[PDB]
Amino acid sequence: PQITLWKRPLVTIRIGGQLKEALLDTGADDTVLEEMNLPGKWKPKMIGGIGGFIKVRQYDQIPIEICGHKAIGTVLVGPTPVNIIGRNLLTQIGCTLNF
Amino acid sequence: PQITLWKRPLVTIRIGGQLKEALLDTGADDTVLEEMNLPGKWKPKMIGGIGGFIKVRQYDQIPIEICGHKAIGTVLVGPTPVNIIGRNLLTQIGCTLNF
Ligand SMILES: COc1ccc(S(=O)(=O)N(CCCc2ccccc2)C[C@@H](O)[C@H](Cc2ccccc2)NC(=O)c2cccc(O)c2)cc1
Numbered sequence: 001p002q003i004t005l006w007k008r009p010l011v012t013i014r015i016g017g018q019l020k021e022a023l024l025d026t027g028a029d030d031t032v033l034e035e036m037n038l039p040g041k042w043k044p045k046m047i048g049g050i051g052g053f054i055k056v057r058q059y060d061q062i063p064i065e066i067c068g069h070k071a072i073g074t075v076l077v078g079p080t081p082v083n084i085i086g087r088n089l090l091t092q093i094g095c096t097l098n099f
Numbered sequence: 100p101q102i103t104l105w106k107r108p109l110v111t112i113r114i115g116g117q118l119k120e121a122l123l124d125t126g127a128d129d130t131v132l133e134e135m136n137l138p139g140k141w142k143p144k145m146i147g148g149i150g151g152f153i154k155v156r157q158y159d160q161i162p163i164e165i166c167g168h169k170a171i172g173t174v175l176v177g178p179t180p181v182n183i184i185g186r187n188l189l190t191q192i193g194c195t196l197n198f
Pocket residue numbers: 023025026027028029030031032047048049050051080081082084086124125126127128129130131146147148149180181183185
């Protein structure tokens with residue numbers, strides 16, 4: 001689709017059979033989800049945003065369907081304030097910015 | 100332009116006698132610029148991101164040129180690590196997400 005920006009670019013994602021709302025975020029290098037359980041090994045990681053650094057759990061090779069487009073990649077889980085789809089998965093679904 | 104997301108979508112903006120590199124950021128409601136002493140009235144504000152909140156100065160009706168496209172709107176100035184062009188200006192220059 002083409003998504004305009006007068007509203008937040010929130011979309012439905014499917015991850016582990018669960019439907020969630022997530023923000024398509026070109027300013028995010030990584031995909032960061034609110035705390036949830038995901039299967040498999042994770043490793044502790046730290047990431048930084050506008051207000052400082054947080055601790056997250058890094059899960060690799062996780063399938064995420066974003067508005068019906070399939071990605072398989074790294075998902076960080078932690079105290080992000082909102083679910084964020086970052087460039088690591090936006091590139092997999094062929095997302096670009098256009099003006 | 101079409102801008103892919105393999106790297107951070109950094110572009111040149113101009114605000115007065117300062118050309119600046121800024122992130123085209125669909126996950127940002129507002130435009131947040133690194134510390135700069137803009138003229139005119141402003142209002143204090145707190146904005147929240149990953150890691151918590153920062154204190155910023157809200158300046159209104161500031162002209163900002165982004166890759167040659169003219170915009171005018173609210174600019175938040177504060178201790179952000181990166182200049183962020185948010186949706187308030189992205190819409191004005193006709194920016195969409197496409198996949
Ligand atoms: C109201 O206006 C704004 C509010 C917030 C922001 S933002 O910069 O924090 N923010 C709002 C996000 C939604 C959100 C909303 C509410 C809480 C938490 C997240 C904009 C993000 O795109 C942000 C931009 C960025 C990049 C580098 C350094 C610093 C910031 N990226 C990130 O936080 C980020 C995420 C993952 C990995 C990474 O390396 C960076 C910008 C504008």
